[PDB]
């Protein structure tokens, strides 16, 4: 029944940043120590949980890295986000590219469908994040019809148990209806999942699903900072 | 009634912080900004419903001023004065302006904006424009009336979310300005989710950008969070 | 007479400008005097008619003011636009934001429908200008159905005789089919006109109608120059 | 004319639209004019790239100030002249690329006497409007007899505008569009009126995109343009 | 059949860059030599295969050149992409304009249809690259209908065996569904192929297909660097 897990309050934010060429320089040791200190402090304060930091190099123009963090209260994410930008050189030398905000809620029909991060699953080595906006008719549609469509949609993913879904309401937290995050040990599994999921009636009820942000989880800030353009 | 006939223009003036412009020495900037707002209050022409920290809501937006006046020129003067004579306005950029003009509802004359009713502003706010489908206003009137009544019924479980829907024709690119004010952000999220389950959603063309943020108590609160 | 007004050749341009923070400064008396002389000169030269200069402060991001000028030859506007930008402090410190160009022509079915500025009517204290693009099927539609639609469109505006219309062809003069300008003594009259005109069948034949620019006609240049950001 | 030779010849066409960088030109422009004029002299001398005209787009739209229309047998020759203009002239160094409209002349599908004014070797018009074009998805798979009829009525709608010379040119894979369009006339109002009239055609039911438009006046020499540009 | 060529794992990236005016200057010989040694190094490491470097001069605003490279693992592309931007002057004076990422997979119906780069075919002297997004209904269409539509699509290109196609899944690797590249000895044949391919029923099942990037494969880096704006 997952009643407790369906009832908890957790805001989730994908903070996507772009490197400013020429800003970081080549002596990045102090910049890495400071950034690491900032994340250390977040962990100990216990309010904002960093699920991952991601190297988005080569995914798209105008984005380079992403922080996925989660908190019981959105003002806690606000504070940390603002703190990153204001009180760390890394945040001072990066530009905000895109923010994907969401608030976990129970599914309408399948109460066993819960985000990977809510289930406490270890995060995947590879991720793709994107927003979603359903067709205008999607929610006023007869409920048994929508139920059947979502049942097919889930069935279409049967061969990809290794790809972990995170489908989270984003209404009023930006321009979208949902935040999506797919975690997997291998990028090719996410590509193949997305390709297979095109073969679903649910595709007839879609309005927007970009931008996509795809990248590799790093073990520590030093691994990301060293990759960035100077 | 007298409220349905009241004249108030309302403006959501959304601003973006220019990285590197504010610096780390903001004491004088705060005091000057507070004097601007204090001066507005005692002149008594423009009412500031709230100033809002939008940090983390979206790229390219950082804070919002919601102010109201009887005449649009009064808002024009305050907006220009803020950009012209306060450092905070000089080192900020205008991201988006949401303008509206209070008018009665086409059917429900009791439906009145929270700011017209003088209600205390909410800790959390979501602001956005709205554009109906092309066919919406030439629809049969009782059909539209019924659709809007069911729309409102779907919000019954959210009496703590206060709504403001105000005409915005010719005051920019939109038909309506919306503001929802609540004591907790999650109430606003859940209201929008629930309100998707309505026939009115078959008659929508545009509803973005959204701006969501926390009301602050004084300008110092906001200035001290900005990126700098 | 009416034939003379329908056959007149008049180009019209809405030149919308954006202030550049930091360029104008705080000592503006000479800036004002110089701009007043430029427009005074325009008046006396007798080629370009300045119908108004409008404070757009607060209408939209990225615009601050607008010049509405008219001439028999588009080259006369090009010269006045180029001379404004090149030879006045005000034009040097402004960016061009949008240009709305149009060429007066007779209406298709009602040759008594003429732009306010062609009638020679005094300009209104408040204005809204915007482009317009009709649906693809509008002009090839049965002429009698389009005629009836426009007749009803006109009737829906009956309650707003104090709001003066200007509807002018804009084909090939930018990205639009028509330029619109609505002039009124109070802004609320324009807002309520636009709202009422939604209740017309012509709304089913629209493709584009943004950006809108709305503001206050100044009595002299000083009113505008003194409000702009420094 | 030799319609067969005109239809089979290979010519690429590029509308290169530029915007002046504010504050970049300055008030001392003679050296820039002499250098730019020397550049166009060189192109004419080499005989590869043909400049049909340089156009002053003042007052047409924000973010565009002038346009070069040049034509060559080989696209690489346009690439070379375009790059050399930007790289080796101050004019090109202090301007920004706003928009590029590339095309390759081909015979028309039904009326092989319909040829671009530039292929016919006609004097270029004093006024020009250029724009891309993208047809509806269904346009090409349509019954050919139906498409033919629609295009015949389209051409008929322009019967009163023989002074406006058309250039309709394929643009597939040379940018984001299906056609490049250029209409050349002795006065601007003729183009405005032609476009208005052409809305009254069935072809309008098979359109997807037709912007941005770039409209302006042909200059006689580089000096006339450089001296109008915003400082 | 082509079992091995169809099961092969290859990521492909089109990395489109734009020149930063004023950055390169007129001193370029050492920049060329450093870039050449960067690509020589990639070759010797044997992980990332550069299929071509392309001069896009004159194709479109805000793009100037493209790298087409291929690797078994996407992280190897990320590393080369990041190393190009970080450790070569050429990378540092260029801006990322657009990235076009794809992952080779077997065709749905015709497993003899394989990308030209997967077939080991020599790259073409001229290229056009673009993304693709099909209509929402494409993949749920009856399979035999879609098969028929694609067979007629392939038939329409029968006169163009000289233009070699690369159609590659792009799901989750950006905002698109497919990456397309068409390589030929002559540019005019690519234009003619695209024209002809409009005459197919598949065209009724299309949503997005831009931006296009078209240009000439260079024989060496110096041919590219010396044409770029200074
Ligand atoms: C990938 C992907 C997308 C984006 C691409 C597209 O939609 O085709 C995608 C799109 C969405 C979107 C919006 C929603 C939000 C609900 C809606 O009203 O749209 C959304 C929500 C749900 N998804 Fe979804 N998805 N999805 C999976 C992956 C993808 N999903 C995988 C895998 C599974 C299967 C495993 C799982 O349950 O964890 C799965 C199942 C569900 C269920 C549970 C249905 C059930 O089985 O009854 C719900 C609820
Ligand atoms: C949230 C939200 C939106 C945007 C999302 C959506 O469109 O689904 C939203 C959309 C709009 C838009 C445009 C209009 C403007 C009128 C029109 O023609 O569009 C608009 C206008 C009205 N709303 Fe609306 N809304 N709305 C609420 C919240 C939201 N509303 C809540 C709560 C209530 C419940 C009542 C109350 O609190 O006043 C409510 C009811 C009304 C009534 C009164 C109907 C009645 O009860 O008979 C009018 C008139
Ligand atoms: C406001 C407004 C818009 C934009 C909003 C919308 O389209 O709903 C608006 C849209 C357009 C557009 C395009 C055109 C161009 C013609 C076409 O083919 O679209 C356009 C053209 C016409 N309008 Fe229009 N309008 N419009 C008024 C206000 C607005 N109008 C008012 C007031 C009156 C009434 C007073 C007058 O004649 O001056 C009025 C009447 C006309 C007539 C004359 C009709 C007649 O036979 O009675 C013509 C022709
Ligand atoms: C202006 C204008 C446009 C853009 C606006 C619009 O689409 O309404 C415009 C749009 C297009 C477009 C795409 C094409 C490309 C073919 C396609 O399949 O769409 C395109 C192609 C053709 N046009 Fe077209 N036009 N067009 C003229 C002006 C405009 N035209 C004038 C003038 C004439 C008449 C004189 C001339 O032939 O030179 C004329 C006729 C033709 C013929 C020859 C028809 C014949 O059989 O009679 C062909 C082929
Ligand atoms: C050009 C061009 C486009 C983009 C323009 C437009 O779509 O009209 C174009 C679009 C696409 C797109 C997406 C796909 C991806 C699959 C899908 O579901 O969309 C896509 C996929 C395929 N194409 Fe395609 N194309 N295409 C060729 C050229 C173009 N193609 C040429 C040449 C040949 C023929 C030679 C070859 O097999 O390599 C050819 C054939 C195929 C086959 C094999 C069909 C078969 O014969 O049964 C498949 C699979």
Residue numbers in the entry:
A (entry chain B), C (entry chain D), E (entry chain A): 6 to 235
B (entry chain E): 8 to 235
D (entry chain C): 5 to 235
List sentences quoted exactly from the publication behind this structure.
ChdCs are enzymes involved in the prokaryotic heme biosynthesis pathway mainly of monoderm bacteria, but some diderm or intermediate representatives also use this pathway. They catalyze the hydrogen peroxide–driven oxidative decarboxylation of iron coproporphyrin III (coproheme) to iron protoporphyrin IX (heme b). After initial oxidation of coproheme to Compound I (two-electron deficient reaction intermediate), a catalytic tyrosine radical is generated, which is completely essential for both decarboxylation reactions. Mechanistic studies revealed the order of decarboxylation and proved that propionate at position 2 (p2) is decarboxylated first.
Exchange of Y135 with a tryptophan, in order to mirror the situation in the active site, led to a very inactive variant (data not shown), we therefore eliminated Y135 by inserting an alanine residue (Y135A), as has proven to keep the formation of Compound I perfectly intact in previous studies. The structures clearly show that the introduced amino acids occupy the positions of the respective residues in the wild-type protein. While the distance between Y135 and Cß-p2 is about 3.1 Å in the wild-type structure, the Y183 oxygen lies about 4.4 Å above the Cß of p4. Both single mutations leave the active site and the overall structure is unaffected. Y135A, in contrast, exhibits a very similar UV–Vis spectrum to the wild type (Soret maximum at 391 with a shoulder, visible bands at 490 and 631 nm) but shows no spectral shift of the Soret maximum upon titration with H2O2. Instead, an absorbance decrease of the Soret maximum and emergence of a single band at 580 nm are observed. As there is a lack of catalytic Y135, no decarboxylation activity with H2O2 is observed in this variant. Y135A is unable to perform the decarboxylation reaction on coproheme. This variant will form Compound I in the presence of H2O2 and, due to the lack of the catalytic tyrosine for Compound I* formation, the variant will instead oxidize coproheme to get back to the ferric resting state.
